[PDB]
């Protein structure tokens, strides 16, 4: 119930991201956009808009945001870092945003376990039966892809904020060690990464 | 692919959320 | 005790918001290559040498500014530098260990052997550059009476507000570690505080809460509180231990203005042995001081 | 409104010009549109109006 | 705190003089209209205006 | 979200008939168009486009323009884009379209007699008084409101026939433009780009020759002379299976379009008016 | 204590005759989707906001009505809602557990965590929507004398009439469970009563008769009968336990008007320690009250 | 407490609009009887002043207005202050409130229109219009010399005659805005401009020049100060009588 | 519509496609 209200808030945030996507007005789904390398401008615009959206959420009182940014869509393995598909380097005063399009495409193309898993839900056969007697859309897979991209750009934006607030040195050190944001919220609340946890165990 | 060692604890830290006392 | 001195901001640095103390401008030789880049701020007292000023201005790698401050406190020095270069935040304080510049300005504020900058861990607890506040538990947050209690339950709300904005929470009450720990346990504050001051402590109820007071130096030629009038050096050292090598400003809140060693702001509260609704006003004062710092660096 | 009811297109135009050469154009739009809509709706001597039985 | 769902459909005033509004944006005005104006009847004037003007 | 999709205010008053109204989203764009892209394409063989004029720093004059959807073989009625009131009934197969659409067209061309005939015919529908008259009222009111909005006379120096070199004399295309309704005139202004644009004694030429023609028959995707301009355009099957897995590709493409270029726009002392 | 408040009737609901308490109109967000449909009646105090009224009336899903009632009793609130929407019957009372609306109106009348509506068992004991009557055995139905006896044997006929019309029979006598059980056994009432109040009871003569008085809350800031002036909350909870989540009206019949916590009707009888032919008149009074409710909702 | 002509416009009616568009300088009890907003929006002028010299330590901030008329305006668009014969034409009487129309009629001596508007508005409106009359007439009388320094606008007298034809408030406005190219300081004539920046004629005050095109007046030398580009108003020859450094 | 000015001049004739 309460948890359902927070779920509704999270889905509303996703819907706001959807409004941003519609504002961008892309003909293709983000999966196809990323699959299409020629759509470099579309990819850059998507990333920039997502970053601005996350910035507005993280700083509700702040509406300003860097209105120009150098962008480079990378494809080669040597042009990407595992665990950081998006990077923010500086070419001696020039702010470069590197994108690992192949990694984005791979993540999006991964099959999701929508049907496979069974989870608890509002399920009341009496209500269903009572209803039966009284008698442009987004799929679960698309929502999952869209959440994945939003969280990826959230990680990238956190690294970017470290870069801007502290500097390139601390940005690199954060890339090396991510322990800075185990606390996270300490602004952050509007970031989905602060809503759940994920862990890895030896097995 | 990169043959680079992976830091499991750092990935956990990436997706680690501290819980307050209220 | 108004003393003239020079400060320089590196025009291109690797480590930011860090200051290094030099006994004179010539000390840069001790850094030579690939060490100056790790100290974008340099502070050293001025010997009234116009030729030295000419050399400094010729050093195009640095932006120079001269200011005066009393020779007894980092507070004025840091205010002057921060207003000169519009930097609300300060990094870990570094000194030239090979040639320790003996400035009476410091006298147990803080410092670091310069060479340890690179070893510093940039990652910290709170995003941005949080403020710091140190609280003297005894009669400040609790009641001096034997059955101590929160003088105003609004303490919890004030601490939560501090955390939400982002500000390291520190306790230093000149009592026994056991006394302060049990006071925390009874008043159910505990997890509120990032740092606690009074092998850290082991009672099977706490893992590590009171960093052992290993650091002993008696006094720096000043007759005052027997232990100390509080220690910015110790508190900032514990901040670094907690991975906090940066801060915006530091405020000491206690029931005793006598301690007030050197803090960007101070707040005094009544030595009240009984509960009373006043901590809301004290919290108002503290947030007012924070906002005043924000105004100093609002631009 | 009364001019519209009784035609008097001359007075109607005079009023519109006065209200235009001075917001007020928005009020022109609202009032004239509503009145003309009702008039055309009544308009017994036409079709598409649901009046003549 | 704020609550809203979407644009809504409501009643329609059918008297001509309901459109009477002060030409002033800075000075509000509200015409006196009988609620009968909200009946989908032949009457395109509300009882109030009818009595007031045509007796 | 004002839907200005004229020709989407069509209701299949017949119960057995359902009107999909699958028309273009841009109707919700508060532009100078009063008819959105898909209606334009279907009923006027035009595709909406925009022509930037000054686009250097912030001066972003973007004149709108539509494109021919008429090949180089069509002629007469097939080529007429916007027929005159005298011939629109013939150019359009009104009988093949829904009576509501016919009513919309008749209102646009001021064919009140046809409007009366259509409502008289609807008089004899089974559910006439119940909902047919309601549909009539809704469609008629919407169309009338749109027409009044378009008409500037309700409650600038663009000449369309003044470009035509080699013409004997007369022009009169602007005469017929005047004869057109406010909606039609605004449509012509919105879709047709004057070949010349003069600002405070500063003339810009966009084409070396106008592409459209205007005459008594109306607006025609014809040329001032010579032949017509070239204007080209899952259910897995056996053929859909591709064979074994295994030339200016590197250069951009100039559109093979025929935008509506015709007329001269004169602007007085007013500067680069961007409001 | 006249307090203004708003009530809304859902224009299309799945669960009928159910009311939900909200601290304010904005609480509907906590229901979101596919939860509001299970509360066709919504009650919340009014903050005198015309813009709120405009929002509510714009909420075409609800029919709104405003009424005033003293801020101390569900009786007036329920009368007002039931007369507003011509509903003689009330379903299980629901509240927003996530955000409990603290209305002094309630103060131990009844409630339910909203989310438990779907789990409610519609099936009940009596067809239709029966009334409820609670009897205080001691001196009300029996004689206060040690050798207790039915003060008027017409008690059996009155109870049979109640059952025949359809009305849940409840006993609450502030005595020992054993005392009340043996009183039932001696006066041969026993099976007459649906519910009994004074692991339920085990004596090898009874299986389960006195629901253990597990629910303990002391008083809700009211100095009165040490145990309680009776509990509409407890009795309705036992009704639900007996699968009675609906009722028409509730009447408390006893020998003590002091208890009278909150009941749609009340009847007082003499504290007579000896048999006397009066229970026929008391039954006449009770049926008169029932008929009065039937008149209130005769239309 | 402030002073602004046309600020006396009280909501006599319930017809078109009113919001008190008065610049804060109305509170500045200067020699003007009109504030910046009204001056700008009714005469295309901006209030300004001008010091003179410290030789005798006078440095008086000479009152003067700034042209708000470019070099492309002609006729009406170039007329700054209209005469009684053309004020109605230049001003959109149908746009401004009947209160301001009454103010113009009074200041230009159009009592016929004043009474016409009064009678029309009678059908609390009458008393509010009477309050407007009180305020406007008080201002007019205050400006009027007729009650209890040879500022020639022609010598550098047809021009002075036209200025006199103007009302007390209008004459005050003209003398406050315009600045003589020549000013005598009691037997010492000083020239401050070699040319005129405005002309007074039958139509009234015109942002024109004696000859040639109209003065241009639109709407990395960081290390130097700036000189204003706008054109202040300049016309006439004023003579200060036998008076001392009258800094009073 | 692009504002570019392509190069159009003269007459061209071809038999078959030759492409
Ligand atoms: Zn009315
Ligand atoms: Zn003013």
Q: What is the 3-state secondary structure (H, E, C) of chain G?
A: CEEEEEEEEECCCCCCCCEEECCCHHHHHHCCCCCHHHCCEEEEECCCCHHHHHHHHHCCCEEEEEEEEECCCHHHHHHHHHHHCCCCCECCEEECCCCCCCCCCCCCCCCCEHHHCCCCCCCCCCCCCCEEEEECHHHHCECCCCCCCECCCHHHHHHHHHHHHCEEEEEECCCCHHHHHHHHHHHCCHHHCCEEECCCCCCCCCCCCECCCCCCCCCCCCCCCCCCCCCHHHHHHHHHHCCCCCECCEEEEECCCCCCCCCCEEEECCCCCCCCCCHHHHHHHHHHHHHHHHHHCCC
Tell me, in angstroms, the distance from the centre of ligand 1 to residue D16's CA. Answer: 23
Interface contact C261, partner B, CB < 8 A: no
In the three-class reduction of DSSP (H, G, I as helix; E, B as strand; rest coil), residue C254 is classed as: strand
Distance from CA of B7 to the nearest CA of A (A): 9
Distance from CA of H89 to the nearest CA of D (A): 13
| DSSP output for C2-21 | EEEEEEEEESS-SS-S-EEE
Chain E residue nearest residue H18, CA to CA: E26
Strand bridging mode H204-206 / H79-82: antiparallel
**Looking at the CA of H37, which ligand is closest?**
2
Interface contact D7, partner E, CB < 8 A: no
Nearest to A186 among C16, C122, C163 (CB): C163
Which residues from G are below 8 Å from E6, CB to CB? none
Alpha carbons within 13 A on the beta-carbon side of F61: 11
Q: Which chains have 3+ CB pairs within 8 A of I?
A: F
Burial of F157 (0-12, 13-18, 19+ CB in 10 A): exposed
Which residues from G are below 8 Å from E3, CB to CB? 25-26, 28-29, 55, 59
A interface with C, Cβ–Cβ below 8 Å: 161, 165-167, 169-170, 173-174, 177-181, 183-184, 186-188
H70 and H59 in contact (C-beta within 8 Å)?
no
Interface contact B14, partner C, CB < 8 A: no
Q: What residues 7-26 of chain H have any CB closer than 8 A to a CB of chain D?
A: 16-17
Q: Which chains have 3+ CB pairs within 8 A of C?
A: A, B
Interface contact B16, partner C, CB < 8 A: no
Burial of A76 (0-12, 13-18, 19+ CB in 10 A): exposed
| CA angle C129–C240–C110, rounded 5-degree value | 95
Other Cβ atoms within 10 Å of H7 Cβ, number: 19
Measure the N-to-C terminal CA separation of chain G; round to a whole number of Å.
Answer: 30
Distance from CA of C128 to the nearest CA of A (A): 7
Chain H residue nearest residue D23, CA to CA: H16
Please give the structure tokens belonging to residue G32: 């979101």
Alpha carbons within 13 A on the beta-carbon side of F227: 5
* CA–CA distance, D35 with D41 (Å, rounded to integer): 10
Element (H, E) at E49: helix E47-49
Chain C interface mutation, best of A161, A166, A173, highest count of C Cβ atoms under 10 Å = A166
Which residues from B are below 8 Å from A202, CB to CB? 8
Chain E residue nearest residue D30, CA to CA: E19
Can you list the alpha helix ranges (DSSP code H) found in A59-139?
101-109, 125-134
Which residues from F are below 8 Å from I3, CB to CB? 51-53, 206
G81 and G115 in contact (C-beta within 8 Å)?
no
Interface contact E27, partner H, CB < 8 A: yes
Other Cβ atoms within 10 Å of F111 Cβ, number: 19
* CA–CA distance, G86 with G88 (Å, rounded to integer): 6
A192 and A13 in contact (C-beta within 8 Å)?
yes
Can you list the alpha helix ranges (DSSP code H) found in C109-209?
137-140, 154-165, 177-187
Distance from CA of F50 to the nearest CA of I (A): 6
Chain A interface mutation, best of C117, C127, C160, C245, highest count of A Cβ atoms under 10 Å = C127
- Determine the length of chain H: 248
**Looking at the CA of E15, which ligand is closest?**
1
Chain I residue nearest residue F247, CA to CA: I19
In the three-class reduction of DSSP (H, G, I as helix; E, B as strand; rest coil), residue C103 is classed as: coil
> Each residue of H140-155: b (16+ CB within 10 Å) or e?
beebeeeeeeebbbee
The reply to whether residue H15 touches residue E24, judged by beta carbons under 8 angstroms, is: yes
Interface contact D31, partner E, CB < 8 A: yes
Chain C residue nearest residue B19, CA to CA: C191
Which residues from I are below 8 Å from F67, CB to CB? 1
The reply to whether residue A127 touches residue G14, judged by beta carbons under 8 angstroms, is: yes
* CA–CA distance, G61 with G55 (Å, rounded to integer): 11
Closest CA to H38 of H125, H116, H108, H100: H100
Tell me, in angstroms, the distance from the centre of ligand 2 to residue H3's CA. Answer: 7
- Name the method of structure determination: cryo-EM
Which residues from C are below 8 Å from B22, CB to CB? 156, 160
Strand bridging mode G265-268 / G250-254: parallel
* CA–CA distance, G237 with G250 (Å, rounded to integer): 13
Other Cβ atoms within 10 Å of H75 Cβ, number: 10
Which residues from A are below 8 Å from C127, CB to CB? 161, 165, 180-181, 183-184, 186-188
Residue F2 φ/ψ, nearest 5 degrees = -60, 120
Interface contact F115, partner D, CB < 8 A: yes
Region at G162 (left for phi over 0; alpha for psi -120 to 50; beta for the rest): alpha
Using alpha carbons, list the distances in angstroms from residue C119 to A159, C35, C168.
21, 13, 22
* CA–CA distance, H79 with H73 (Å, rounded to integer): 9
The reply to whether residue A83 touches residue B8, judged by beta carbons under 8 angstroms, is: no
Nearest to E17 among D1, D19, D41 (CB): D1
Other Cβ atoms within 10 Å of F189 Cβ, number: 18
Alpha-carbon Rg of chain G, whole angstroms?
Answer: 20
* CA–CA distance, C86 with C43 (Å, rounded to integer): 16
* CA–CA distance, C82 with C88 (Å, rounded to integer): 6
Q: What share of chain H is helix, strand, coil (3-state, %, to 5)?
A: 30, 15, 55
| DSSP output for chain F | -----TTSS----STT--------GGGGS-SS-SS-HHHHHHHH-EEEEEEEEEESSS-EEEEEEEEE---SS--GGGTEEEE-TTTHHHHTTGGGS-HHHHHHHHHHTT-HHHHHHHHHHHTTSTTIIIIIHHHHHHHHHHHHHHHHHH-TT----EESSTT-TT--S---HHHHHHHS-HHHHHHHHHHPBPSEEEESS-EEES-SS---EEETTEEE---SSSSPPP-------STTS--S----TTS-------B-B--EEEE-S--S---
Which residues from E are below 8 Å from G60, CB to CB? 8
* CA–CA distance, A15 with G150 (Å, rounded to integer): 69
DSSP C191: G
The reply to whether residue H16 touches residue E29, judged by beta carbons under 8 angstroms, is: no
* CA–CA distance, C294 with A103 (Å, rounded to integer): 42
Residue G223 φ/ψ, nearest 5 degrees = -85, 115
Tell me, in angstroms, the distance from the centre of ligand 2 to residue H25's CA. Answer: 8
Final resolution, Å: 5.2
D42 and E15 in contact (C-beta within 8 Å)?
no
Distance from CA of C3 to the nearest CA of A (A): 32
Strand order in the sheet with A70-74: A70-74, A95-100, A86-90
Other Cβ atoms within 10 Å of C195 Cβ, number: 21
Sign of the C-alpha dihedral computed for residues G254, G258, G261 and G267 taken in this order = positive
H66 and H45 in contact (C-beta within 8 Å)?
yes
* CA–CA distance, F104 with A142 (Å, rounded to integer): 41
**Looking at the CA of H24, which ligand is closest?**
2
Tell me, in angstroms, the distance from the centre of ligand 2 to residue A32's CA. Answer: 62
């Amino acid at each position: 119930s309460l948890e359902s209200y927070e779920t509704l808030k999270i889905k509303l945030a996703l819907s706001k991201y959807m409004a941003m996507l519609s504002t961008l007005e892309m003909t293709q789904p983000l999966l196809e956009i990323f699959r299409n390398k020629a759509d470099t401008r579309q990819i850059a615009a998507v990333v920039f808009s997502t970053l601005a959206f996350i910035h507005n959420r993280f700083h509700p009182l702040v509406t300003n945001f860097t209105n120009k940014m150098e962008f480079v869509v990378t494809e080669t393995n040597d042009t990407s870092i595992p665990g950081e598909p998006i990077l923010f380097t500086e070419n001696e005063g020039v702010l470069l945003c590197s994108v690992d399009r192949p990694s984005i495409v791979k993540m999006l193309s991964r099959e999701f376990d929508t049907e496979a898993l069974v989870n608890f839900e509002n399920d009341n056969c009496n209500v269903r039966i009572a209803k039966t007697f009284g008698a442009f859309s987004i799929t679960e897979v698309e929502a999952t892809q869209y959440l994945t991209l939003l969280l990826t750009v959230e990680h990238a934006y956190l690294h970017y904020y470290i870069f801007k607030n502290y500097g390139v040195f601390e940005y690199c050190k954060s890339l090396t060690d991510h322990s800075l944001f185990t606390n996270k919220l300490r602004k952050t609340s509007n970031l989905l990464l602060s809503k759940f946890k994920f862990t890895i165990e030896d097995f | 692919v990169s043959n680079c060692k992976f830091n499991i604890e750092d990935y956990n830290n990436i997706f680690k959320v501290m819980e307050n006392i209220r | 005790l108004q003393s003239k001195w020079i400060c320089l901001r590196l025009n291109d640095a690797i480590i930011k918001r860090h200051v290094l103390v030099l006994s004179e401008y010539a000390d840069l030789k001790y850094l030579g290559f690939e060490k100056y880049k790790f100290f974008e701020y340099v502070i050293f007292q001025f010997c009234n040498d116009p030729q030295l000023c000419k050399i400094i201005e010729n050093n195009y790698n640095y932006c120079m500014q001269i200011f005066k401050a009393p020779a007894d406190d980092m507070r004025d020095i840091r205010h002057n530098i921060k207003r000169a270069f519009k930097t609300p935040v300060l990094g870990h304080m570094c000194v030239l260990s090979n040639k320790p510049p003996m400035y009476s300005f410091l006298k147990e504020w803080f410092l670091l052997p310069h060479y340890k900058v690179v070893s510093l861990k940039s990652e910290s607890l709170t995003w941005g550059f949080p403020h710091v506040v140190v609280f003297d538990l005894d009669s400040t947050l609790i009641t001096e009476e034997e059955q101590v209690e929160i003088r105003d339950p609004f303490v919890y709300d004030s601490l939560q507000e501090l955390h939400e904005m982002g500000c390291v929470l520190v306790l230093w009450s000149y009592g026994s570690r056991d006394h302060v720990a049990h006071s925390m346990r009874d008043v159910d504050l505990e997890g509120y505080f990032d740092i606690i001051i009074s092998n850290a402590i082991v009672d099977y109820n706490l893992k590590k809460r009171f960093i052992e007071n290993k650091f002993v130096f008696d006094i720096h030629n000043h007759r005052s509180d027997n232990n100390i009038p509080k220690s910015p050096k110790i508190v900032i050292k514990y901040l670094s231990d907690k991975n906090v090598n940066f801060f915006k400003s530091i405020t000491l809140v206690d029931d005793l203005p006598t301690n007030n060693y050197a803090y960007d702001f101070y707040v005094k509260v009544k030595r009240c042995p009984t509960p009373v609704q006043d901590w809301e006003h004290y919290h108002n004062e503290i947030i007012q001081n924070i906002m005043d710092y924000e105004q100093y660096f609002i631009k | 409104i009364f001019h519209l009811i009784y035609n008097n297109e001359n007075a109607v135009n005079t009023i519109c010009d006065n209200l235009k050469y001075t917001n007020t154009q928005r009020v022109i739009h609202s009032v004239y549109a509503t009145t003309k809509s009702i008039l055309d709706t009544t308009n017994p001597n036409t079709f598409c109006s649901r009046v003549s039985r | 705190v704020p609550v809203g769902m979407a644009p809504r459909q409501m009643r329609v005033n059918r008297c001509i003089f309901a459109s009477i509004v002060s030409f002033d944006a800075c000075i509000t005005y509200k015409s006196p209209c009988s609620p009968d104006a909200y009946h989908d009847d032949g009457w395109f004037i509300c009882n109030n205006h009818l009595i007031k003007r045509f007796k | 979200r004002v839907n200005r999709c004229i020709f989407a205010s069509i209701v299949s008053f017949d119960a057995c008939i359902t009107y999909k109204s699958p028309c273009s989203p841009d109707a919700y764009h508060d532009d100078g168009w009063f008819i959105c892209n898909n209606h334009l394409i279907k009923r006027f063989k035009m595709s909406k486009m925009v022509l930037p004029i000054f686009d250097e720093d912030d001066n972003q004059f973007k004149m709108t323009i539509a494109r021919h959807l008429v090949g180089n073989k069509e002629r007469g009625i097939k080529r007429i884009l916007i027929p005159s009131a005298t011939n629109y009934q013939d150019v359009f197969n009104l009988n093949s379209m829904m009576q509501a659409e016919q009513l919309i067209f008749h209102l646009i061309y001021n064919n009140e007699n046809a409007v009366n005939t259509i409502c008289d015919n609807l008089k004899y529908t089974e559910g006439f008084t119940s909902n047919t008259q309601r549909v009539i009222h809704s469609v008629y009111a919407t169309t009338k409101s749109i027409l009044d909005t378009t008409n500037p006379n309700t409650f600038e120096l663009r000449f369309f026939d003044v470009t035509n070199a080699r013409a004997l004399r007369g022009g009169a295309g602007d005469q017929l433009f005047n004869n057109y309704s406010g909606f039609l005139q605004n449509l012509i202004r919105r879709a047709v780009a004057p070949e010349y644009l003069q600002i405070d004694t500063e003339e810009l030429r966009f084409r070396n020759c106008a592409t459209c023609i205007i005459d008594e028959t109306g607006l025609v995707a014809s040329v001032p002379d010579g032949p017509e301009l070239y204007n080209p355009i899952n259910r897995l099957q056996i053929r859909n299976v591709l064979k074994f897995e295994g030339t200016l590709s590197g250069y951009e493409e100039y559109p093979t379009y025929v935008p509506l270029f015709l007329g001269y726009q004169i602007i007085n002392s007013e500067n680069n008016f961007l409001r």
